[PDB]
Amino acid sequence: LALKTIDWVAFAEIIPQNQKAIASSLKSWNETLTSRLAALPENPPAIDWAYYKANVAKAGLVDDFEKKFNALKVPVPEDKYTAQVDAEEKEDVKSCAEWVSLSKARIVEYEKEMEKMKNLIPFDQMTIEDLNEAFPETKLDKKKYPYWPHQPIENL
Amino acid sequence: IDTEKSQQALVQKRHYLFDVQRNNIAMALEVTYRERLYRVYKEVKNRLDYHISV
């Protein structure tokens, strides 16, 4: 049975806050399957007829019972579930690939802004217009205060 | 910037939830298969040794 390598709280970094219970419930179930497969071996230990032919006094009952055994098809379970979660994973890969693309645009937008703020002319040369352009919070609100000093007198 | 980068790393690691779903499904069906194996094995041996014991 091929299995996938797993870190565990690396799995908890990515889990959102709406399905924590679901997440660690799947974790618990994973542990149940770990110990349960580790317990029993792969195949059942086949049985010898010599101890079962030289013992049973019934007419060939050993042979036909074990023939039905060695001529039995046990129903192999089928997945029917990995494909849907694989497709779900592909779709999520798409969604967050585009998310990270958008945020890369934002990365270098921020870095352009940082290069601007790093390329600011020294302050003893800057005019009030240039300080306003480089710190647009300092622009006096000429709408809520149309008359001098163009701000509340408390801040004045 | 650094917060954006950390978000990128997390969303990179995203795929563990899906592969864990995969692992759990696989293990569950394997466990069920071996349980069926042992069910039928045990019970036919039970019939056989019932006959032997009687």
The Cα–Cα gap between A85 and A79 comes to 11
> Exposed, middle or buried: residue A144 (CB in 10 Å: 0-12, 13-18, 19+)?
exposed
Burial A79-110 (b: 16+ CB within 10 A, else e): eeeeeebeeebeeeeeebeeeeeebeeeeeee
Cβ atoms of A89 and B18 closer than 8 Å: yes
Per DSSP, the three-state class of A59 is coil
The Cα–Cα gap between B29 and A79 comes to 7
How determined?
cryo-EM
Return the structure tokens found at A156: 């004045």
The Cα–Cα gap between A75 and A147 comes to 88
Cis peptide before A152 (omega within 30 of 0): no
**Residue A88 with chain B: CB contacts under 8 Å:** 18
Resolution (Å) of this entry: 2.8
> Exposed, middle or buried: residue A119 (CB in 10 Å: 0-12, 13-18, 19+)?
exposed
Task: Fill in the DSSP letter of residue A122.
Answer: P
- B40: contact with A, CB 8 A cutoff: yes
Cβ atoms of A16 and B34 closer than 8 Å: no
CB contact under 8 A, A79 and B37: no
Return the structure tokens found at A42: 């792969």
The Cα–Cα gap between A37 and A42 comes to 9
Residues contacting A30, CB < 8 A, separation 6+: A6, B20, B23, B24, B27
* Phi, psi for residue A89 in degrees, rounded to 5: -65, -40
Cα-Cα-Cα-Cα dihedral of A76, A82, A83, A85, to 10°? 160
CB contact under 8 A, A79 and B16: no
Closest approach of chain A CAs to the CA of B46, in angstroms? 12
Q: Which residue of A has its CA nearest to B53?
A: A56
Tell me how crowded residue B29 is: count the other CB atoms within 10 A of its CB: 19
Residues A46, A35, A8: CA angle, nearest 5 degrees? 145
Cβ atoms of A33 and B28 closer than 8 Å: yes
Tell me how crowded residue A120 is: count the other CB atoms within 10 A of its CB: 13
**Residue A43 with chain B: CB contacts under 8 Å:** 37
Q: Closest Cα partner for B26 from A78, A60, A89, A12?
A: A78
